């Protein structure tokens, strides 16, 4: 999980101007692995 | 390949050459000329899993 988020606000008075901005981002990754291997051999020799 | 009959295997030559097969539990008449004929068994097993 990764998040980056910023909020900015400005007001100026002299005339009055204001700007406010909010920006946010979220990033997530999940990976799951599984593996199974089995091997077997038989030899039988009879006389 | 095995091929056709070449030797007469049943010329008894006027003999009564009985053999008792312990396998078949029966008497058989051998030819008068065959050197030997015997009925003991061998068994060979080869088994593989992979």
C-alpha A20/C-alpha A2 separation (Å) is 24
Strand blocks (E) in B1-50? 18-21, 26-29, 45-49
C-alpha A27/C-alpha A40 separation (Å) is 45
Residue with tokens 């008894």: B12
Solved with: cryo-EM
Whether B5 has its CB under 8 Å from any CB of chain A: the answer is no
- For chain A, the first-to-last Cα distance in angstroms comes to 66
Torsion angle, alpha carbons of B12, B15, B21, B24, to 10: 50
C-alpha B11/C-alpha B32 separation (Å) is 7
Which chain A residues have a beta carbon less than 8 Å from that of B41? Answer: none
Q: 3-state DSSP call for residue A13?
A: strand
Subunit contact B43:A40, Cβ cutoff 8 A = no
Instruction: Please provide the size of chain A in residues.
Output: 47
Please name the residues in contact with A13: beta carbons below 8 A apart, sequence gap of 6 or more. Answer: none
Resolution (A): 3.3
Residue with tokens 């077997």: A40
């Amino acid at each position: 999980e990764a998040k980056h988020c910023v909020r900015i606000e400005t007001k100026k008075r002299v005339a009055k101007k204001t700007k406010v901005e909010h920006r946010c981002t979220t990033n997530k990754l999940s990976e799951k692995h599984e593996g199974s291997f089995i091997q077997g051999a038989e030899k039988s020799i009879s006389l | 390949q095995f091929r056709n009959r070449v030797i007469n295997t049943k010329s008894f030559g006027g003999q009564c050459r009985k053999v008792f097969s312990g396998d078949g539990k029966d008497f058989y008449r051998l030819s008068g000329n065959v050197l030997s004929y015997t009925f003991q068994v061998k068994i060979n097993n080869d088994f593989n899993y992979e």
